[PDB]
Amino acid sequence: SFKYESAVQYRPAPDSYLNPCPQAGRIVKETYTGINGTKSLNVYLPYGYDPNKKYNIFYLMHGGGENENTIFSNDVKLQNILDHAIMNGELEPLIVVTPTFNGGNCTAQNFYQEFRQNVIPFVESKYSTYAESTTPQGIAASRMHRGFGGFSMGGLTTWYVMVNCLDYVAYFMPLSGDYWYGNSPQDKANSIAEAINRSGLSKREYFVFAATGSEDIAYANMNPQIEAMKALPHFDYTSDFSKGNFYFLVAPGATHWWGYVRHYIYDALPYFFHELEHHHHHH
Structure with a gap:
């Protein structure tokens, strides 16, 4: 069974994991209408998906x-x-949703608004997450079971989701993207700190597992931001989320390509959703 490490290292999934598995989750193409017009997304359901069970969800x-x-x-x-x-x-079974920041007036920076208003209620009223209902109250009450991550411009999306949606999301996985709000790494870290202040949340109620490759140009602007965030009292640096809430995985030699980034997800996603989980697990 999964066990937290305090400084988890980059490890690609075995090559066999890139080939189809007989226990295949179902992927459902969905279309919905929101503030940015009619758009689509995909929903991965785990093998064995049972709508009378509750699943964590990662966007x-x-x-x-x-x-x-x-x-x-x-x-x-x-x-x-x-x-x-x-x-x-x-990896414990969960729902994985792949939306888009394309369409209408949507951008990677402003997607969080559509996420809040349209995407969460659409998806989570159709599929069984820990949200008992999809009112703002119902979404907020299930935040510990909801995560957001993304690559590159989608990593930027993740940071804007974090600063604007702490009430709805507890776990963040920014991959190869920095937060574009501010003229210095301190401005960036302070913005995040201010969002955490406003949320009223404790340090045990939000978690950030960032990653990139040592040869991925995102590192240049990401690393300084991570360092500034490390200096804040809001974050306790370690991958062991039973103790702290912030980690930055840097894959040696990896470049700016999904061929590598998919492995960051393999490495990080197993770390999500265990704190205050409803199952009795030892990690």
Whole structure:
């Protein structure tokens, strides 16, 4: 069974995990209408999905030039990794949603508004998450069971989601993207700190697992931000989320490509959703 490490290291999923698994989760293409017009997304349901059980949910955003289909396309194949990891007990079953910041007036920076108003209620009123209802109250009450992450421009999306949606989301996975709000790393960290202040949340109620590659140009602006965030009292640096709430995984030699980034998800996603979980697990 999964056990937290305090300084988890980069490790790719075995090559066999990139091939289809017999215990395949179902991927459902959905279309909805929101503040940015009619748009689509994909919903990965785990193998064995039972709508009378409750699942954690992770929303995962593509990068620049991509779309809601990329992550489950032949160019990434994340579903194969998810399938194999869940089958082998490395990852607890959960719902994974791949939306898009394309369409209408939407941008990577402003997607959080559509996320709050349209995406969460649409998805979580159709599929069984810990949200008993999808009113603002129902979404907020299930925040410990909701995560957001994304790559590149989708990492930027993640940071804007964090600063504007702490009330709705507890776990964040920014991959190869920095937060564009501010003229210095301190401005950036302070903005995040101010959001945490406003939320009233404790340090045991939000968690950030950031990652990039040592040869990924995102590192240049990410690293300084991470360092500034480390200096804040709001974050306790360690991958052991039973103790702290902030980690930055840097994959040696990895470049700005989903071929690597998919493994960051393999490495990090198993770390999410255990704190205050409703199951009796030892991690």
